[PDB]
Amino acid sequence: DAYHPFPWYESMRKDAPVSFDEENQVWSVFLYDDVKKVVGDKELFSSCMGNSIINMDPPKHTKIRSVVNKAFTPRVMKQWEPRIQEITDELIQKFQGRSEFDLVHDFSYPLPVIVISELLGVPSAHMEQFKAWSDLLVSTPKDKSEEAEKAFLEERDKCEEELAAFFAGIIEEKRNKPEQDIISILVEGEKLSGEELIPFCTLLLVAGNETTTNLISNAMYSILETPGVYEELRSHPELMPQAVEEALRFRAPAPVLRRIAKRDTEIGGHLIKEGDMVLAFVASANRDEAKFDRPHMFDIRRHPNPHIAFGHGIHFCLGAPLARLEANIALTSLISAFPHMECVSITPIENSVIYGLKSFRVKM
Numbered sequence: 019d020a021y022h023p024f025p026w027y028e029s030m031r032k033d034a035p036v037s038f039d040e041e042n043q044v045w046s047v048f049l050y051d052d053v054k055k056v057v058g059d060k061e062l063f064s065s066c067m068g069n070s071i072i073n074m075d076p077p078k079h080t081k082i083r084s085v086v087n088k089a090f091t092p093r094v095m096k097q098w099e100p101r102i103q104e105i106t107d108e109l110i111q112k113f114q115g116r117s118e119f120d121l122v123h124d125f126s127y128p129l130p131v132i133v134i135s136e137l138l139g140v141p142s143a144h145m146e147q148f149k150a151w152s153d154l155l156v157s158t159p160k161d162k163s164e165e166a167e168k169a170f171l172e173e174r175d176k177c178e179e180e181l182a183a184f185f186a187g188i189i190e191e192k193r194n195k196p197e198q199d200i201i202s203i204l205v206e207g208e209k210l211s212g213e214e215l216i217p218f219c220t221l222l223l224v225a226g227n228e229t230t231t232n233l234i235s236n237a238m239y240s241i242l243e244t245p246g247v248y249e250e251l252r253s254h255p256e257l258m259p260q261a262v263e264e265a266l267r268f269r270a271p272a273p274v275l276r277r278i279a280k281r282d283t284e285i286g287g288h289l290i291k292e293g294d295m296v297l298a299f300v301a302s303a304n305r306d307e308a309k310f311d312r313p314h315m316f317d318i319r320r321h322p323n324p325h326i327a328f329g330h331g332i333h334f335c336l337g338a339p340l341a342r343l344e345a346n347i348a349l350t351s352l353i354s355a356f357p358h359m360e361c362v363s364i365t366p367i368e369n370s371v372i373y374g375l376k377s378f379r380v381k382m
Protein backbone atom coordinates (compact mmCIF):
# COMPACT_ATOMS: atom_id res chain seq x y z
CA ASP A 19 0.00 0.00 0.00
CA ALA A 20 0.91 3.70 0.24
CA TYR A 21 2.77 3.13 3.50
CA HIS A 22 5.09 0.63 1.78
CA PRO A 23 6.82 2.34 -1.15
CA PHE A 24 10.32 1.11 -0.29
CA PRO A 25 10.37 -2.07 -2.36
CA TRP A 26 9.42 0.04 -5.40
CA TYR A 27 12.16 2.60 -4.70
CA GLU A 28 14.58 -0.33 -4.36
CA SER A 29 13.53 -1.68 -7.76
CA MET A 30 14.04 1.75 -9.41
CA ARG A 31 17.44 2.33 -7.81
CA LYS A 32 18.46 -1.03 -9.26
CA ASP A 33 16.58 -1.10 -12.58
CA ALA A 34 15.77 2.50 -13.55
CA PRO A 35 17.59 4.98 -11.31
CA VAL A 36 17.02 7.91 -13.70
CA SER A 37 13.65 7.53 -15.40
CA PHE A 38 11.53 9.67 -17.75
CA ASP A 39 7.73 9.69 -17.59
CA GLU A 40 6.48 10.41 -21.09
CA GLU A 41 2.94 11.32 -20.04
CA ASN A 42 3.84 13.91 -17.44
CA GLN A 43 7.20 14.73 -19.05
CA VAL A 44 9.12 14.49 -15.81
CA TRP A 45 12.32 12.80 -14.72
CA SER A 46 12.48 10.76 -11.50
CA VAL A 47 15.81 10.29 -9.73
CA PHE A 48 16.29 7.58 -7.08
CA LEU A 49 19.98 7.17 -6.10
CA TYR A 50 21.50 9.06 -3.17
CA ASP A 51 24.28 10.82 -5.13
CA ASP A 52 21.91 11.80 -7.95
CA VAL A 53 19.16 12.98 -5.59
CA LYS A 54 21.59 15.00 -3.47
CA LYS A 55 23.15 16.66 -6.52
CA VAL A 56 19.75 17.65 -7.99
CA VAL A 57 18.52 19.02 -4.67
CA GLY A 58 21.71 20.89 -3.79
CA ASP A 59 22.92 22.19 -7.12
CA LYS A 60 21.35 25.66 -7.17
CA GLU A 61 23.38 26.60 -10.24
CA LEU A 62 21.84 23.85 -12.41
CA PHE A 63 18.46 23.10 -10.81
CA SER A 64 15.89 25.81 -9.99
CA SER A 65 13.25 25.81 -7.25
CA CYS A 66 11.08 28.36 -9.03
CA MET A 67 7.90 26.46 -9.90
CA GLY A 68 3.18 33.67 -2.94
CA ASN A 69 5.03 30.50 -1.94
CA SER A 70 7.77 32.45 -0.16
CA ILE A 71 11.38 31.23 -0.02
CA ILE A 72 10.91 27.53 -0.81
CA ASN A 73 10.12 28.48 -4.42
CA MET A 74 12.63 31.30 -4.83
CA ASP A 75 16.08 31.22 -6.38
CA PRO A 76 19.00 33.45 -5.52
CA PRO A 77 19.37 36.29 -5.21
CA LYS A 78 15.81 36.83 -3.87
CA HIS A 79 16.10 33.68 -1.76
CA THR A 80 19.43 34.69 -0.27
CA LYS A 81 18.10 37.97 1.06
CA ILE A 82 14.99 36.57 2.74
CA ARG A 83 16.62 33.36 4.05
CA SER A 84 19.34 35.31 5.83
CA VAL A 85 16.76 37.47 7.60
CA VAL A 86 14.55 34.56 8.74
CA ASN A 87 17.44 32.44 10.08
CA LYS A 88 17.23 34.67 13.15
CA ALA A 89 13.89 33.09 14.07
CA PHE A 90 15.30 29.53 14.40
CA THR A 91 18.63 30.00 16.25
CA PRO A 92 19.58 27.64 19.04
CA ARG A 93 18.83 30.48 21.49
CA VAL A 94 15.22 30.77 20.30
CA MET A 95 14.65 26.98 20.32
CA LYS A 96 15.99 26.85 23.89
CA GLN A 97 13.57 29.62 24.80
CA TRP A 98 10.57 27.64 23.56
CA GLU A 99 11.46 24.12 24.76
CA PRO A 100 9.61 24.77 28.05
CA ARG A 101 6.38 25.61 26.21
CA ILE A 102 6.63 22.73 23.74
CA GLN A 103 7.03 20.41 26.73
CA GLU A 104 3.97 21.85 28.44
CA ILE A 105 1.88 21.47 25.28
CA THR A 106 3.04 17.88 24.89
CA ASP A 107 2.20 17.02 28.49
CA GLU A 108 -1.26 18.57 28.12
CA LEU A 109 -2.06 16.52 25.02
CA ILE A 110 -0.97 13.32 26.73
CA GLN A 111 -3.09 14.06 29.83
CA LYS A 112 -6.23 13.85 27.68
CA PHE A 113 -5.60 10.20 26.73
CA GLN A 114 -3.39 9.09 29.65
CA GLY A 115 -5.99 6.68 31.05
CA ARG A 116 -7.15 4.92 27.89
CA SER A 117 -6.40 1.36 26.85
CA GLU A 118 -6.62 2.32 23.18
CA PHE A 119 -6.18 5.56 21.25
CA ASP A 120 -5.31 7.04 17.87
CA LEU A 121 -1.76 8.40 18.04
CA VAL A 122 -2.48 10.69 15.07
CA HIS A 123 -5.79 12.31 16.06
CA ASP A 124 -4.96 12.53 19.76
CA PHE A 125 -1.29 13.47 19.67
CA SER A 126 0.81 13.91 16.53
CA TYR A 127 -1.83 15.84 14.51
CA PRO A 128 -2.64 18.58 17.03
CA LEU A 129 0.85 19.01 18.51
CA PRO A 130 2.67 20.89 15.71
CA VAL A 131 -0.30 23.19 15.11
CA ILE A 132 -0.47 24.26 18.74
CA VAL A 133 3.28 24.75 18.82
CA ILE A 134 3.47 26.90 15.69
CA SER A 135 0.48 29.00 16.68
CA GLU A 136 2.23 29.92 19.95
CA LEU A 137 5.51 30.44 18.14
CA LEU A 138 3.67 32.71 15.67
CA GLY A 139 2.14 34.71 18.50
CA VAL A 140 -1.43 33.70 17.73
CA PRO A 141 -3.47 35.14 20.60
CA SER A 142 -4.85 32.30 22.73
CA ALA A 143 -8.39 33.61 22.29
CA HIS A 144 -8.14 32.90 18.54
CA MET A 145 -6.81 29.35 18.55
CA GLU A 146 -9.81 27.60 16.90
CA GLN A 147 -9.98 29.90 13.91
CA PHE A 148 -6.28 29.27 13.41
CA LYS A 149 -6.60 25.50 13.72
CA ALA A 150 -9.46 25.62 11.20
CA TRP A 151 -7.19 27.34 8.68
CA SER A 152 -4.44 24.76 9.30
CA ASP A 153 -6.95 22.00 8.56
CA LEU A 154 -7.93 23.61 5.29
CA LEU A 155 -4.27 23.85 4.32
CA VAL A 156 -3.96 20.05 4.22
CA SER A 157 -7.36 19.24 2.72
CA THR A 158 -7.36 17.09 -0.41
CA PRO A 159 -8.34 18.43 -3.87
CA LYS A 160 -10.79 15.52 -3.62
CA ASP A 161 -12.43 14.08 -5.43
CA LYS A 162 -11.09 13.59 -7.80
CA SER A 163 -9.26 15.74 -10.36
CA GLU A 164 -12.64 16.09 -12.05
CA GLU A 165 -11.95 19.73 -12.91
CA ALA A 166 -13.35 20.46 -9.44
CA GLU A 167 -9.71 21.25 -8.73
CA LYS A 168 -10.75 24.72 -9.87
CA ALA A 169 -12.90 24.83 -6.73
CA PHE A 170 -10.30 23.45 -4.33
CA LEU A 171 -7.79 26.04 -5.55
CA GLU A 172 -10.45 28.70 -4.95
CA GLU A 173 -10.98 27.52 -1.38
CA ARG A 174 -7.21 27.48 -0.98
CA ASP A 175 -6.94 31.09 -2.15
CA LYS A 176 -9.81 31.95 0.18
CA CYS A 177 -8.05 30.27 3.09
CA GLU A 178 -4.70 31.88 2.28
CA GLU A 179 -6.26 35.34 1.91
CA GLU A 180 -7.85 34.92 5.34
CA LEU A 181 -4.48 33.84 6.76
CA ALA A 182 -2.80 36.87 5.18
CA ALA A 183 -5.23 39.34 6.81
CA PHE A 184 -4.95 37.52 10.12
CA PHE A 185 -1.14 37.60 10.04
CA ALA A 186 -1.33 41.27 9.01
CA GLY A 187 -3.18 41.94 12.24
CA ILE A 188 -0.70 40.04 14.40
CA ILE A 189 2.20 41.80 12.69
CA GLU A 190 0.75 45.21 13.66
CA GLU A 191 0.17 43.96 17.19
CA LYS A 192 3.78 42.81 17.57
CA ARG A 193 5.02 46.17 16.32
CA ASN A 194 3.34 47.77 19.34
CA LYS A 195 3.90 45.01 21.89
CA PRO A 196 6.68 42.57 20.91
CA GLU A 197 7.07 39.25 22.72
CA GLN A 198 9.31 36.18 22.19
CA ASP A 199 7.60 34.82 19.12
CA ILE A 200 8.85 34.56 15.53
CA ILE A 201 6.75 37.52 14.35
CA SER A 202 8.15 39.80 17.07
CA ILE A 203 11.65 38.72 16.09
CA LEU A 204 11.15 39.50 12.39
CA VAL A 205 9.49 42.90 13.00
CA GLU A 206 12.10 44.25 15.42
CA GLY A 207 19.53 45.64 9.06
CA GLU A 208 17.33 42.64 8.28
CA LYS A 209 13.92 44.18 7.63
CA LEU A 210 11.25 42.34 5.71
CA SER A 211 8.08 43.98 4.43
CA GLY A 212 4.64 42.56 5.15
CA GLU A 213 4.45 41.36 1.55
CA GLU A 214 7.37 39.06 2.36
CA LEU A 215 6.58 38.36 6.01
CA ILE A 216 3.00 37.24 5.48
CA PRO A 217 3.77 34.62 2.80
CA PHE A 218 6.64 33.44 5.04
CA CYS A 219 4.31 32.85 8.04
CA THR A 220 1.88 30.89 5.88
CA LEU A 221 4.80 28.76 4.58
CA LEU A 222 5.66 27.79 8.14
CA LEU A 223 2.25 26.11 8.44
CA VAL A 224 2.42 24.60 4.96
CA ALA A 225 6.00 23.35 5.34
CA GLY A 226 5.92 22.43 9.02
CA ASN A 227 2.55 21.23 10.30
CA GLU A 228 1.86 17.99 8.48
CA THR A 229 5.54 17.04 8.04
CA THR A 230 6.16 17.26 11.77
CA THR A 231 3.01 15.29 12.52
CA ASN A 232 4.09 12.65 10.04
CA LEU A 233 7.62 12.54 11.46
CA ILE A 234 6.20 11.86 14.91
CA SER A 235 3.79 9.17 13.65
CA ASN A 236 6.41 7.54 11.42
CA ALA A 237 9.02 7.52 14.23
CA MET A 238 6.66 5.85 16.67
CA TYR A 239 5.69 3.29 14.03
CA SER A 240 9.33 2.50 13.28
CA ILE A 241 10.07 2.27 17.01
CA LEU A 242 7.18 -0.15 17.66
CA GLU A 243 8.00 -2.34 14.69
CA THR A 244 11.63 -2.78 15.78
CA PRO A 245 12.06 -5.35 18.58
CA GLY A 246 13.34 -3.99 21.90
CA VAL A 247 13.69 -0.36 20.80
CA TYR A 248 10.65 0.99 22.70
CA GLU A 249 11.97 -0.45 25.95
CA GLU A 250 15.54 0.69 25.24
CA LEU A 251 14.35 4.26 24.60
CA ARG A 252 12.24 4.21 27.76
CA SER A 253 15.29 3.09 29.78
CA HIS A 254 17.74 5.30 27.90
CA PRO A 255 16.02 8.49 26.76
CA GLU A 256 19.46 9.95 25.92
CA LEU A 257 19.46 7.86 22.75
CA MET A 258 16.49 9.81 21.37
CA PRO A 259 18.23 12.50 19.27
CA GLN A 260 19.97 9.75 17.30
CA ALA A 261 16.74 7.76 17.07
CA VAL A 262 15.04 10.81 15.60
CA GLU A 263 17.72 11.05 12.89
CA GLU A 264 17.14 7.39 12.04
CA ALA A 265 13.38 7.98 11.83
CA LEU A 266 14.08 10.85 9.42
CA ARG A 267 16.28 8.56 7.35
CA PHE A 268 13.97 5.55 7.49
CA ARG A 269 10.55 7.19 6.99
CA ALA A 270 11.00 10.75 5.72
CA PRO A 271 7.66 12.64 5.74
CA ALA A 272 8.52 14.55 2.56
CA PRO A 273 9.65 11.82 0.13
CA VAL A 274 10.05 13.84 -3.06
CA LEU A 275 11.31 17.30 -4.06
CA ARG A 276 10.91 19.12 -7.40
CA ARG A 277 13.47 21.06 -9.44
CA ILE A 278 13.65 22.54 -12.92
CA ALA A 279 16.81 22.19 -15.01
CA LYS A 280 18.22 25.65 -15.81
CA ARG A 281 20.52 24.20 -18.47
CA ASP A 282 20.95 21.00 -20.42
CA THR A 283 22.97 18.73 -18.15
CA GLU A 284 23.47 15.08 -17.24
CA ILE A 285 22.28 13.27 -14.15
CA GLY A 286 23.52 9.74 -13.61
CA GLY A 287 24.62 9.81 -17.24
CA HIS A 288 21.22 10.86 -18.59
CA LEU A 289 20.72 14.15 -20.45
CA ILE A 290 18.16 16.41 -18.77
CA LYS A 291 17.00 19.21 -21.07
CA GLU A 292 16.82 22.84 -20.00
CA GLY A 293 13.34 23.40 -18.64
CA ASP A 294 12.73 19.73 -17.75
CA MET A 295 11.05 18.95 -14.43
CA VAL A 296 12.89 16.54 -12.10
CA LEU A 297 11.53 14.63 -9.11
CA ALA A 298 14.26 13.85 -6.56
CA PHE A 299 13.14 11.04 -4.24
CA VAL A 300 14.86 11.79 -0.94
CA ALA A 301 12.90 8.88 0.52
CA SER A 302 14.70 6.56 -1.91
CA ALA A 303 18.07 8.28 -1.39
CA ASN A 304 17.77 7.59 2.31
CA ARG A 305 17.56 3.81 1.63
CA ASP A 306 20.36 3.68 -0.93
CA GLU A 307 22.78 0.82 -0.27
CA ALA A 308 25.58 2.78 -1.97
CA LYS A 309 25.55 5.36 0.81
CA PHE A 310 24.17 3.54 3.87
CA ASP A 311 25.25 0.24 5.34
CA ARG A 312 22.29 -2.16 5.74
CA PRO A 313 19.75 0.56 4.77
CA HIS A 314 16.82 -1.79 5.43
CA MET A 315 17.57 -1.79 9.13
CA PHE A 316 16.08 0.75 11.54
CA ASP A 317 19.14 1.35 13.71
CA ILE A 318 18.66 4.09 16.31
CA ARG A 319 22.43 4.09 16.81
CA ARG A 320 23.31 4.71 13.16
CA HIS A 321 26.19 7.20 13.14
CA PRO A 322 27.01 9.14 11.10
CA ASN A 323 23.60 9.46 9.49
CA PRO A 324 23.75 11.77 6.41
CA HIS A 325 20.10 11.43 5.44
CA ILE A 326 18.58 14.11 3.27
CA ALA A 327 15.15 14.18 4.89
CA PHE A 328 15.51 17.95 5.40
CA GLY A 329 17.03 18.54 1.96
CA HIS A 330 20.50 19.84 1.17
CA GLY A 331 21.99 23.21 0.28
CA ILE A 332 20.43 26.67 0.27
CA HIS A 333 16.85 25.44 0.82
CA PHE A 334 17.80 23.05 3.66
CA CYS A 335 14.81 22.97 5.99
CA LEU A 336 14.63 26.20 8.00
CA GLY A 337 12.50 24.37 10.55
CA ALA A 338 14.95 21.51 11.06
CA PRO A 339 15.88 22.49 14.64
CA LEU A 340 12.19 22.97 15.56
CA ALA A 341 11.14 19.65 13.99
CA ARG A 342 13.99 17.87 15.77
CA LEU A 343 12.97 19.56 19.05
CA GLU A 344 9.27 18.78 18.64
CA ALA A 345 9.97 15.12 17.80
CA ASN A 346 12.44 14.61 20.64
CA ILE A 347 9.99 16.06 23.14
CA ALA A 348 6.93 14.38 21.66
CA LEU A 349 8.57 10.94 21.47
CA THR A 350 10.39 11.00 24.79
CA SER A 351 7.21 12.22 26.50
CA LEU A 352 4.96 9.63 24.90
CA ILE A 353 7.29 6.73 25.70
CA SER A 354 7.71 7.92 29.30
CA ALA A 355 3.94 8.07 29.84
CA PHE A 356 3.33 4.54 28.58
CA PRO A 357 5.13 1.42 29.83
CA HIS A 358 4.01 -0.64 26.85
CA MET A 359 2.39 0.06 23.49
CA GLU A 360 1.38 -2.10 20.52
CA CYS A 361 0.23 -1.31 17.01
CA VAL A 362 -3.39 -2.23 16.31
CA SER A 363 -3.99 -0.67 12.90
CA ILE A 364 -2.82 2.01 10.50
CA THR A 365 -4.45 3.94 7.68
CA PRO A 366 -1.89 5.46 5.32
CA ILE A 367 -2.14 8.82 3.65
CA GLU A 368 -2.75 8.26 -0.06
CA ASN A 369 -0.75 11.13 -1.56
CA SER A 370 2.38 10.80 -3.69
CA VAL A 371 4.10 13.88 -2.22
CA ILE A 372 3.41 12.88 1.40
CA TYR A 373 4.53 9.93 3.55
CA GLY A 374 2.64 9.34 6.78
CA LEU A 375 -0.47 8.12 8.57
CA LYS A 376 -4.09 9.33 8.67
CA SER A 377 -4.62 7.17 11.75
CA PHE A 378 -2.37 5.11 14.01
CA ARG A 379 -4.30 3.10 16.58
CA VAL A 380 -2.31 1.66 19.47
CA LYS A 381 -3.18 -0.32 22.59
CA MET A 382 -1.63 -0.71 26.04
Ligand code: HEM
Nearest residue numbers: 071072222225226229230233327328329333335336337341
Ligand atom coordinates in the same frame (compact mmCIF):
# COMPACT_ATOMS: atom_id res chain seq x y z
C1 HEM B 1 10.09 16.46 10.03
C2 HEM B 1 9.62 17.67 9.72
C3 HEM B 1 10.06 18.38 8.43
C4 HEM B 1 10.62 17.87 7.32
C5 HEM B 1 10.94 16.39 7.01
C6 HEM B 1 10.88 18.97 6.41
C7 HEM B 1 11.45 18.84 5.16
C8 HEM B 1 11.91 19.88 4.39
C9 HEM B 1 12.67 19.77 3.17
C10 HEM B 1 13.12 18.45 2.50
C11 HEM B 1 12.91 21.01 2.73
C12 HEM B 1 13.72 21.37 1.46
C13 HEM B 1 12.79 21.71 0.31
C14 HEM B 1 13.53 21.78 -1.01
O1 HEM B 1 14.78 21.64 -1.03
O2 HEM B 1 12.84 21.98 -2.04
C15 HEM B 1 12.30 21.95 3.65
C16 HEM B 1 12.33 23.32 3.56
C17 HEM B 1 11.70 24.22 4.40
N1 HEM B 1 11.10 23.94 5.62
FE1 HEM B 1 10.92 22.01 6.38
N2 HEM B 1 10.46 20.14 7.03
C18 HEM B 1 9.97 19.81 8.28
C19 HEM B 1 9.48 20.67 9.24
C20 HEM B 1 9.46 22.03 9.11
C21 HEM B 1 9.02 22.98 10.12
C22 HEM B 1 8.52 22.56 11.52
C23 HEM B 1 9.14 24.21 9.60
C24 HEM B 1 8.81 25.59 10.22
C25 HEM B 1 8.09 25.76 11.33
C26 HEM B 1 9.66 24.08 8.27
C27 HEM B 1 9.90 25.14 7.42
C28 HEM B 1 10.56 25.07 6.21
C29 HEM B 1 10.82 26.20 5.37
C30 HEM B 1 10.42 27.66 5.66
C31 HEM B 1 11.58 25.65 4.16
C32 HEM B 1 12.11 26.46 2.96
C33 HEM B 1 13.56 26.87 3.27
C34 HEM B 1 14.16 27.57 2.08
O3 HEM B 1 13.57 27.47 0.97
O4 HEM B 1 15.21 28.25 2.26
N3 HEM B 1 9.84 22.74 7.99
N4 HEM B 1 11.69 21.21 4.65
